[PDB]
């Protein structure tokens, strides 16, 4: 693998046009491209994969947020603790209305995507994609349980279909699941013992971080509750 360090020279020649991305920084004065994080450089597209527990607002990202406040203009939703609030408009719901407002209390789990996210402006999310049949699991998440994981474990789970988690958990139990890019995973089952079994697995899988240890953990966790 090719490991990258901040401040190091950029291997990619400046001759051929290359689109930017997360992980690299374009100097507003010297106009030189330099890495600002530590990880593996992926060139297809140029970006850097680095370990981070803190999520930042970005366009077209699926996130699971919690309503921390209800205003007259929009909703105040926290995608993560201590981070700045996000603006969820009333018109950001399917079958929107003028006078009539969507029913959401403080503490309700919402599965939405980030539409407009500026660095110097308050981010905004919408409870309907733009668009994928208006139903990618978007909306209020009733009951269930959520778990905090690092951003590395969250993105690989949602995007990569070769990740042996949804594959190994589907065999142990039948359930619906929603994964956000802010390190939040929402899983709901029928019986509470199944949800608890799923929580303990992801908690241990994220800690150990091993692709081939998924089946081993899931086997001993589901047999522990019985």
């Amino acid at each position: 693998s090719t490991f990258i360090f901040p401040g190091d020279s950029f291997p990619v020649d400046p001759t051929t046009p290359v689109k930017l991305g997360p992980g690299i920084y374009c100097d507003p004065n010297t106009q030189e491209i330099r890495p600002v994080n530590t990880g593996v450089l992926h060139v297809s597209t140029a970006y850097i994969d680095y370990s981070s527990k803190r999520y930042i607002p970005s366009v077209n990202d699926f996130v699971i947020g919690v309503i921390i406040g209800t205003f007259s203009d929009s909703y105040k939703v926290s995608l993560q603790n201590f981070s700045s609030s996000v603006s969820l408009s009333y018109m950001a719901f399917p079958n929107a209305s003028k006078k009539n407002r969507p029913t959401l209390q403080v503490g309700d789990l919402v599965y939405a995507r980030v539409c407009t996210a500026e660095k110097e402006l308050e981010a905004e999310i919408e409870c309907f994609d733009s668009t994928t049949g208006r139903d990618a699991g978007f909306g209020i998440l009733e009951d269930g349980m959520i778990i905090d994981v690092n951003l590395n474990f969250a993105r690989q789970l949602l995007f990569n279909n070769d990740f042996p988690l949804l594959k190994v958990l589907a065999a142990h139990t039948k359930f619906e699941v929603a994964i956000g890019l802010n390190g939040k995973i929402w899983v709901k089952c029928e019986e509470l013992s199944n949800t608890l079994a799923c929580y303990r697995t992801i908690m241990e899988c994220c800690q150990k971080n091993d692709t081939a240890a998924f089946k081993d953990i899931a086997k001993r966790q589901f047999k522990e509750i019985l």
Binding site: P28, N29, Q31, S87, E120, L121
Partner: protein, 216 residues
């Protein structure tokens, strides 16, 4: 003027009312207090008396407008943002429906300016808010605030209404108002200059950012 030219705080200048004889008719001079003066009450011969008394050390000026105005000019405080004045401000934060700033200097009248000295790391500096509808006369309804102003950019505006005792309400609707001084990437890059009214370019790194520019 038959009245003392130099006046220290507490020095008597002129009584309440005055009159003179000219052209076979009595002309009534009405003395009114002004900046640096204060109408107070004195006692003498067992009888009350009201007279204009200077409260600031400086020279006395008697002027008339289309009545005699008595004011004392020192050798800032008097200058305060009022409806119609032009004010140089700096962007403190950006929201979606508006843009709040802080007042630095105020344009005088016939350029010269009056710099308001205050601590910017406390919040004692006067704060002002520019509404999204007050950005430009062109398309007042839909205006993208991100493509107009920027944190740190200097904006020349004109105050409409003072509102409450917290924030001032400015506007950049006209041509001579808008972002004056700004740099690339929120101040990280080089200096940028105003070319088009809705476009600001930088003749150094070749960077171009969308702002609300004024007329040179």
């Amino acid at each position: 003027f038959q009245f003392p030219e130099i006046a220290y705080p507490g020095k008597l200048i002129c009584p309440q009312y005055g009159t003179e004889n000219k052209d076979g008719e009595d002309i009534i001079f009405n003395y009114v207090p002004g900046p640096g003066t204060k109408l107070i009450q004195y006692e003498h011969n067992g009888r009350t008396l009201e007279a204009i008394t200077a409260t600031l050390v400086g020279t006395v000026r008697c002027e008339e407008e289309k009545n005699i105005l008595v004011s004392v000019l020192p050798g800032f405080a008097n200058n305060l943002p009022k409806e119609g004045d032009i004010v140089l401000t700096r962007v403190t934060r950006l929201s979606l429906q508006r843009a709040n700033v802080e007042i630095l200097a105020v344009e005088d009248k016939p350029a010269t300016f009056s710099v308001s000295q205050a601590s910017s790391d406390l919040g004692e500096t006067f704060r002002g808010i520019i509404r999204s509808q007050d950005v430009r006369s062109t398309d007042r309804d839909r205006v993208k605030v991100i493509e107009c102003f920027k944190p740190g950019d200097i904006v020349r505006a004109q105050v409409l209404s003072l509102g409450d005792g917290t924030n001032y309400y400015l506007t950049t609707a006209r041509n001579d108002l808008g972002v004056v001084f700004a740099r690339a990437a929120n101040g990280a890059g080089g200096l940028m200059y105003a070319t088009d009214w809705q476009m600001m370019t930088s003749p150094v790194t070749g960077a171009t950012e969308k702002r609300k520019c004024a007329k040179p």
